[PDB]
Amino acid sequence: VQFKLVLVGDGGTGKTTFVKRHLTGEFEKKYVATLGVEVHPLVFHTNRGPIKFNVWDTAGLEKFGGLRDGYYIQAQCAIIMFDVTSRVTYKNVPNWHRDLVRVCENIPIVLCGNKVDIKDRKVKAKSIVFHRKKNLQYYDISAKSNYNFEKPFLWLARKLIGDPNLEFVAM
Amino acid sequence: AARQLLDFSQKLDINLLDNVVNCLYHGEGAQQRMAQEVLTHLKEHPDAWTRVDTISQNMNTKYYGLQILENVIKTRWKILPRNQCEGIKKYVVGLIIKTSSDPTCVEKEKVYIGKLNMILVQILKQEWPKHWPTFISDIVGASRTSESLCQNNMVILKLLSEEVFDFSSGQITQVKAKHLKDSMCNEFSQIFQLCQFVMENSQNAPLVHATLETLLRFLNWIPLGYIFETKLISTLIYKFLNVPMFRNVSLKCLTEIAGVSVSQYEEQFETLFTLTMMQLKQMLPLNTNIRLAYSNGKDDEQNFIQNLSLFLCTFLKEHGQLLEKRLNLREALMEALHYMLLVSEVEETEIFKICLEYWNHLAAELYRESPFSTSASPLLSGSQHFDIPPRRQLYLTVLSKVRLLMVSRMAKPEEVLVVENDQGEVVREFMKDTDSINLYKNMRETLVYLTHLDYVDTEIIMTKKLQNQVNGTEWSWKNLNTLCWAIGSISGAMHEEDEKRFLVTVIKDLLGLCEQKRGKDNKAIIASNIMYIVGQYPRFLRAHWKFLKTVVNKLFEFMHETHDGVQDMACDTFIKIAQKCRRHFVQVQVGEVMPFIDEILNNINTIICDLQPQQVHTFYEAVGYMIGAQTDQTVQEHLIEKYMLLPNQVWDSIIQQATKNVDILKDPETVKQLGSILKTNVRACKAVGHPFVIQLGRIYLDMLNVYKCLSENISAAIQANGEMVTKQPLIRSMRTVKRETLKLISGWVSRSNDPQMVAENFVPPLLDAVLIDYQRNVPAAREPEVLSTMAIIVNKLGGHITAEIPQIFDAVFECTLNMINKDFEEYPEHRTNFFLLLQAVNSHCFPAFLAIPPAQFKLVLDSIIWAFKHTMRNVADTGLQILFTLLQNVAQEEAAAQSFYQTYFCDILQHIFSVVTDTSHTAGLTMHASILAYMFNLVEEGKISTPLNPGNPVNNQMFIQDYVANLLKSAFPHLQDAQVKLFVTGLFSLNQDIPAFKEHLRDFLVQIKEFAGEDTSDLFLEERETALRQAQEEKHKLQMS
Amino acid sequence: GSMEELSQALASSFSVSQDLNSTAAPHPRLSQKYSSLEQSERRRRLLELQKSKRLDYVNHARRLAEDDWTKKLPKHYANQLMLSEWLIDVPSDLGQEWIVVVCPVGKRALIVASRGSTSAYTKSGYCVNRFSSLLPGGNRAKDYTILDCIYNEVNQTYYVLDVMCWRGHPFYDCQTDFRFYWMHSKLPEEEGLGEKTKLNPFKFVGLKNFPCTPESLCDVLSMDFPFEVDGLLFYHKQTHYSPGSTPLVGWLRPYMVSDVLGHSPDHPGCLMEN
């Protein structure tokens, strides 16, 4: 039960920081731009057994895109990420969604607003609506404070299998 | 041997085919594949044909090849030989033909086909009208011959529509888009017919859905005649809405049409609504439990439900009053509102937020019509009273069901999270603006409107639900919580007198229920809720001292309650109450001889006994809101002495021991204590305000002595054994004393009100103990919070600390700068913080810069440039503001201004352009254009002198206009002179219309990615030139007098 | 009216734990109700008559020691301490059948030394500190120790008030005079339990108990204590150790005993370099 999960979004959105926390539990404070893509297996233990996400953490910066949409090929789900401290990143979402689905017809896609821990929220929850019409799931997350940390994965896991009652149990 | 790179070894395609397979399946060596394939793209593509022309992991490779080709078309197209364009042009169309003309194309993933299509769209984008005149006629024709060809074409036309309308901005210059825009409009009729023909004579379900899906993208822009003047709305509702496999796309279309403004098409909209409802009443019986249907639904009926919720909400939003004003439509309105109510019971957050958006809208609308309750129960004098506003009448009974909805599903008012910080500390973090908290605000607001329109209905609904808890056994914690959250949400929506009667009823029976239910689990839940409720009604408490006192004493009792959560509840409520009722604790109340605060301060220990450290801090903060309400300075000062007597006792004990032996300041337990003492002081400080000076002035100097003792410890430890020493208790705990010392400091100054006093007494000691300590720590030991602390004190003291800016900058400037100038990645918190301080200096202490040596000033400006070149979005824009504020500041210093323009103006320009044209900085566009606009506008009159050294010929404007063109020239040689000259000229014309300036910068970033050549001349360098002068005419019309 | 009734209902009929004469609230003499009571002599006799020993304090001391889990005994670290009630109905046989323990201002805690380390927990089972101690089982799987202490901040000293488990043997089933006796003979000769060291950062010191005779009470009330005095606890000599509140121990504040029967600002304290 392995699943390919591409992680896209603007630069500095916290994609790599997010993935890092799930694997090591450490919080990286620095922003070292991702170069093309880097594949990270993530394992979760669920009521029904272990689930493994091969997270293709892709680059959000234009200069380091790499194979771009080429990475999406054969993806089975995805997380579109933006930073609620930066209005620009949300506005680019439709571009990230476009690229992804033109490659991936029907896959579960979660939309995540990262950094909700920063008191100076610029992308108000009221403005976050793009996911409605694309039939996508949305979650506020913080990699720093671990707020709604697993929500994207639990949802994706529930959709990829066929079990709404499925739950992460942790060992 | 993977040292193999692609050049002209006249190489094979099986090898490439092999790496491509690894790129998608292996581990480390799979990073080399990527490395290899992305690395290969340097030279060029003499292989595109080779690969695509020769094949699992063939498509993957042809895809890659298609990728190589797309770069070519989007960047080289214009300078590619005409015969090569045609060749590729025909090669692509051929590739499409055969690939789609294969029934096994269904597994040769759309990935390949779609990509192929996007490639044609790329070509179309570069020459659709000019050198492809027949294209649109042709494809419609082809579509009428082959169903298969029609299928794929509907796909192509949808991609075109997206690139030309939905996504043109950013990827296309404004004038190119405009031309492609009204080009596709000019011959759209032709394809609307193809669509209509397909729709009506249809039989190919795949083709129909595609045409349907291509239709969804046209609705974004196609003239509204095509929409409201055709059989379209009808074909949708009658033909495709009632069939399962078209049910979704169909509704989504209706929703887009529904989103338009009713003005010119009252008829149609009404009809759209009428038909939809009928077709809907058959698809979903008005008795079906949607919540259940959804819950046990699949991936197709769930999206239908949601979509249904989007259609209903959008239509009622835009055309709502149109359904009201007509009497023949009021039935279907009640049916639609009923659907809203069923769908609103779906237990799925995103669907609920959609419905909630409408309910909030209706309520807000009816509240704007009239925010009052109707007359008493009987209509005096017989006749049915006229109180009821016209619109509200139609909703009476739905409003009631909505109230019931708000009460029944009320969201959690508070988002608390357990969070471990940058240390082994695990406190409770309260979120501020989460989607969850927003749901709550919005439900509250909905309920709050509806309570203004009929509070009696709100109180009857809330009362019934309460009784169903007490006896009606609708009992449960989830439900009692939800009832009490609702009950607490409407605080202040009733008149104080109704509020009283209502609250006496709500809590008399929660109290009664509490005694009824057995088990601490139940009593703890019930108890917490009464406390939450009381906490939400200060006005009540405020008017009834005997009850207030009883609640507080009762809260003190529960601070000894062991049952999980209660103590947190008790303290949380206590702080709400101490804030909101602060005066009632400091003034003698009726039936009392002494201020209640007194009784509290004589028992602090007996009360906090059992509380954990964090709760103790909250408790101290609580009492501080009280103490800060006692405005008689003599009494207040005595209050503050007693209040801090416990912490002071420990602190004094520790200070005595450190006098004889600085080693205890190294004792784990004592530094543990020191941090908790300081955390107490910060709370106290935050609560009391300026008057706290009494206490901090008492510990100030010793606190700094210990601060610097701890700072030297940490540094020596790091110097001895490297940063690693940092991941361990004692050091981490020493960081904490330091961090809390700086928070206490900035925390108090922030709130002080005697600047000269702060500058003369509290600032100087900082220099030695804090800033020179920072300078003397080894880099990995320097507390970044020192910089933000200083930033805060500068934002607050302004001119009063201007004189000390030099000493300060001497401590931390160059040393900090050296930690962050070798790269953009290391020491993140210093980068952020160093620039917050520079902003505060620039902002509130600008004369300091006119005080320091030109070489010093230069270093300042270079740091600013350094900041705005940063990749971390925060730093860069902090750098753009500072530069904006600094330029504005300079304009105030006439003397130095001219010397600043002579020395720096052009330079600053180069640095900004280097960032504009850098695709890693588009997040700073607004400020880039904002800064350039201003500087060019400044060229008009601002610079009094000569920059080039010959005044006449090189008039400042000419000089820059030339300096900048030449700048863009050598930097981007591929641009033809006309592009450049048009762009630099517009910098001056649009220099007063920033949003235009923006788009104009955006235009340039598109062009520089694309080698136009010297031949191509489709830049419309005349049509833009009029828009520039049109923006130039407005200039004087913008700013004359 | 309805406000006064409300106020009297909130004060007198609102409790999660519902026990009598709780020290969580002020002395019932200052509260002109329902979870208070002037009777204690009777409930005391019953509870002593009740000490027929049917709970397995062997298995419970073990669970605390090894964190292995689940009237009925408390599971986990909350509610492990035996809690006094206010001393209201004074024992007619006080002077011969009870002792008084002078108590320090500090935090009450359950101490569990097990498997190489020591933990302190509040009544609410909140871990306030994990550390090394010279308690058997504290460090350097059969020897675990469980104490009832008051942690005093200024002296960094856990003042031990009672023992429930020593060197792996539970003491719940013992009378308090014995418990108190065992405590003051065993603590004094554990290497340096009363001393501050890297292996024993926190000092443990047993509190003294004294007779409740009329003359004695006057003297301890005139003694000097190494700490700030919080109150006096009165233990019935014969009571087992039973977590939860009980009338078999009573609480008084010191003042209660005599009633019932007896040129600008600041300068440094550390004068280091400015």
Ligand SMILES: Nc1nc2c(ncn2[C@@H]2O[C@H](COP(=O)(O)OP(=O)(O)OP(=O)(O)O)[C@@H](O)[C@H]2O)c(=O)[nH]1
């Ligand atoms: N405050 C806060 N900062 C965060 C959070 N998540 C990430 N960051 C910061 O944002 C930056 C994110 O860095 P990355 O995750 O590497 O950026 P990215 O999304 O991978 O961007 P690219 O790799 O260039 O595509 C780091 O400096 C993090 O410290 C968060 O949840 N809260």
Ligand SMILES: [Mg+2]
């Ligand atoms: Mg990344």
Ligand code: NA
């Ligand atoms: Na008693």
